[PDB]
Design a protein around this ligand. Structure first.
Ligand SMILES: [Zn+2]
Length: 90
RNA sequence: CAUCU
């Protein structure tokens, strides 16, 4: 269930271990929760699913289990996300 | 899967 569509955001921080983090909406300057499984287009050259700090993503703000969460996170245009510094190359 | 370092 969608609150906002194809909104652009700047990833605030993402702990690759915990499997979640926050995306700051360029849209509204609000922080939005993001979980590893919401990453629709992951970097094919990284083992794990992650986003990197300072990275610009395109996502949907959906209603989640405990309030709003990000969904179908991709890069701008739908390109694969870049992924975290701490996720390893294949 | 809720503000981690
Ligand atoms: Zn969720």
């Amino acid at each position: 269930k969608v609150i906002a569509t194809k909104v652009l955001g700047t990833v605030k921080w993402f702990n690759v271990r915990n499997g979640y983090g926050f995306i700051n909406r360029n849209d509204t300057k609000e922080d939005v929760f993001v979980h590893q499984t919401a990453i629709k287009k992951n970097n094919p050259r990284k083992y794990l699913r992650s986003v990197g700090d300072g990275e610009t993503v395109e996502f949907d703000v959906v209603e989640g289990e405990k309030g709003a969460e990000a969904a179908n996170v991709t890069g701008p245009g739908g390109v694969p996300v870049q992924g975290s510094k701490y996720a390893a190359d294949r």
